[PDB]
Ligand binder design. Structure first.
Ligand SMILES: [Cl-]
Ligand SMILES: [Cl-]
Length: 162
């Protein structure tokens, strides 16, 4: 297991524009296109992102490419973020994948706001961080995915994904 296979399990793959859990237009492997209600603003962003007229549909290779960019951007955002970087540096390889997953799902800004959990993770208080991470809208809204991520942080193994 690795970050790519982990996120592929959590996000799935769709080749036609769809709405995410929040009702936003997405395509491929959890690639947010726009928060706007307009399917046309979605198709526009989509064609901008692919560099071709897609009519709302893309190929597998195209989805994977967006995915490669997105993971990369997620890592780079963590490394550039003054609050995230120290946490990431302090973690083992598995736990690092758990943080990247949160960042990809909710953005740097959102994760960065989990102040107390971040501090518990840095301190390696696994059980306590897991309890604190659960008191969040995130956990309440996508409980199955949240539990998997949280188990990854508590355990340091890929068990939740096997
Ligand atoms: Cl893009
Ligand atoms: Cl879920």
């Amino acid at each position: 297991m690795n970050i790519f296979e982990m996120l592929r399990i959590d996000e799935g793959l769709r080749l036609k524009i769809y709405k995410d859990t929040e009702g936003y237009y997405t395509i491929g492997i959890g690639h947010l296109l726009t928060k706007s209600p307009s399917l046309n603003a979605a198709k526009s962003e989509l064609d901008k992102a692919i560099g071709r007229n897609t009519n709302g549909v893309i190929a597998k290779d195209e989805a994977e490419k967006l995915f490669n960019q997105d993971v990369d951007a997620a890592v780079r955002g963590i490394l550039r973020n003054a609050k995230l970087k120290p946490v990431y540096d302090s973690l083992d390889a598995v736990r690092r994948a758990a943080l990247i997953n949160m960042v990809f799902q909710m953005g740097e800004t959102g994760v960065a706001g989990f102040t107390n959990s971040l501090r518990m993770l840095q301190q390696k208080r696994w059980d306590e961080a897991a309890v604190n991470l659960a008191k969040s809208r995130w956990y309440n809204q996508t409980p199955n995915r949240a539990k998997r991520v949280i188990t990854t942080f508590r355990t340091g193994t890929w068990d939740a994904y096997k």
